[PDB]
């Protein structure tokens, strides 16, 4: 896909992980703003990328990777992990039947006439309170987690990181780029300065280290 | 055992077991029914130790079909109750613990396998009970719903008195009898507030002047 | 409109306030039930009356006349009462402008740059906490209030009172019937015994006191 | 006045007025930024009386455009604040009371006229303030939003320290200057955490070994 705005000679292609450097403070500021307020001067497309289809990250530690929407997707994912393990899943079914059986007995014994449905694997997973751990995150760890929840969000097409290179070591930028490619994601890193020596675009428009 | 008293009453009307109280004057009937709804006040219910029966200890029914046997208040009581049955069979509890610890590891196993750094807390018995969807079985007549209400009333130990308002009009003579039989066996204390005599069962009758007579003893 | 079910020789017409007596305990019970569970053996129509279009009252003191939906209608009603009093409404506008003016001044004086919209009559009415008083109701008073909120509910077509005559004096039944007719309502009173000497239907099917 | 200290620091870095702290090593920068987010802990902020600055007394910003000047937390503070301005002008309060009592009667008048038996409570100043929809005016640049954030930070007396993270990258030299001027006039205590030197302003610079030098004094 592509980024374009009127002052570009030609669209900036966005394939996999793209590092875009805006060395002029005023233009760094304006482009970050247009991204933030995308709806618009700046265009991503040759169908246009809707606003809802873009996720923008400026505060890494503050970004919520444990939204109801994401947890649902994680939990579903975990359940589907069992569908590749018929032997183990069947055992779980048997453990839950035994549990169900002990509970239904307590129901019979209760003075009330009680009824019930069933306990599901998904319900067990929800009850266990599974979520992404983030309390201890380093900034790099959290970047990875965002990438990883991003992959679940089939609706979202572009992830944009704002001014994040400053927090990452060379090997860390390396590790993130590698994960992006392995996962077929599309991610834009908006930077105010050249980010080490990775392939990257620079508007003063050139490319460096290809 | 129990007592119903207020200002205009010559004597307190005793509530023992199932009691049919006929308020023959419309105005008296409405007054008393209204007072029950407004209980907090003019009219008093108290046990034999002269301890007052509190609002919260009374269950007041006029809309039989509407009464919700599966109210959140009730379901929470039951789920808690089920959990506690477990907490009194240490061997069964132990079994529950082993099964949940194992299902837990198996799930956490998939968590580790997952790309994401995942944490979690624990699965509790209450959570299993709530996930299984335990609830009170649900009755295709008003008489049948009355029995159910009685069963719930007996289940709820904190509710001490059940008042049915104007329900006689819905019950055959055999049904009234079935009701009072259940009430007898299970030792309930139930007040049937009626606007007129209810067949020929023993019952109190209170006239225009709040004078009490019994009938069919 | 009409009530019908298979055991009737002919539909029972429902015009204004109708008293229907079911002297057989078993049939009183069954018909109350079918009303309760209307969706169905019992028919009200020659288009059929949808279930949502019927309001059923068995517990008079317990019925909620202060629902969000009703309050909205009451409050709107009150506002529209002002639209027939241009002089007074204009004065209220002037009182509220003065209020607005004192508040906006406090806004100017506040260190923050503050903005605002306007205070409306409807907002004043909501803020005042206007609702039907019910805490002290006698059963008769409450019957009247239900009738009175019923009139607001343009969607609802039939109100049914179950076994309520027992609570009402002759003059009270009289007063309710009178209000029903004056307000062009349609109301069914289901009774287990003859209700004094009003015009009424009786299934043992006859009419009495016409 | 204020101090930033922790384990690896030779000396505590003083926070007086507007402070630009350059952490030149990526790892140090990330470590410190991460520690600010996790503040509750390794890193300490304390005033001159050695009283600790609490989590709640710090305002930590990285996402400038995202900061919500009209948060429910803030709006409640402001509305309360507006009410209290009234409670200190007895003559104006008095005027407010008269106007509300009159509008009230006029409304209650329509209530009496209404068929329904209507009750009500009262209209309060807070309710008028909230009905009028008072809120903070809203800025079409990041620099402009920074000023707004500073204005809010000054307004919130319980917030004692403001930390901007990596915001230098967005500001021209004249804008940084405008910011620190506002901070000076209004006496704010602001920490700018930067990954590299910020133009040629006075600033602390902390190296790989947590040795501190000042620059451009
Ligand atoms: Ca289930
Ligand atoms: Ca983590
Ligand atoms: Ca849990
Ligand atoms: Ca408004
Ligand atoms: Ca009233
Ligand atoms: Ca109020």
Residue numbers in the entry:
A (entry chain A), C (entry chain A): 1 to 39, 42 to 47, 51 to 209, 214 to 219
B (entry chain B), D (entry chain B): 0 to 39, 42 to 139, 141 to 219
The authors write:
Csn2 is one of four Cas proteins that comprise the Nmeni subtype of the CRISPR/Cas system. The results of the mobility shift assay indicate that S. pyogenes Csn2 has a non-specific dsDNA-binding function. The tetrameric nature of S. pyogenes Csn2 results in a diamond-shaped ring structure with a positively charged inner surface as seen in E. faecalis Csn2.
The crystal structure of S. pyogenes Csn2 was determined to a resolution of 2.2 Å using multiwavelength anomalous diffraction. The asymmetric unit of the structure contains two S. pyogenes Csn2 monomers, three calcium ions, 204 water molecules and two ethylene glycol molecules. The monomeric structure of S. pyogenes Csn2 contains six α-helices (α1–α6) and nine β-strands (β1–β9), and is organized into two domains. In the asymmetric unit, the two S. pyogenes Csn2 monomers form a dimer with approximate two-fold non-crystallographic symmetry. The close proximity of the α-helical domains of the two symmetry-related dimers indicates dimerization of the dimers, resulting in a S. pyogenes Csn2 tetramer. The only CA2 site in the asymmetric unit of the S. pyogenes Csn2 structure is located adjacent to one of the two hinge regions in monomer A. The calcium ion in the CA2 site is coordinated by three residues (Glu138, Asp142, and Glu150) from monomer A, Asp118 from monomer B of the symmetry-related dimer, and two water molecules. In the corresponding hinge region of monomer B in the asymmetric unit, we were unable to locate a calcium ion. Residues in the hinge region of monomer A are structurally stabilized by the calcium ion bound in the nearby CA2 site, which is missing in monomer B. Such heterogeneity suggests that calcium binding in S. pyogenes Csn2 is important not only for its oligomerization, but also for its conformational diversity, enabling calcium-dependent conformational changes in the protein.
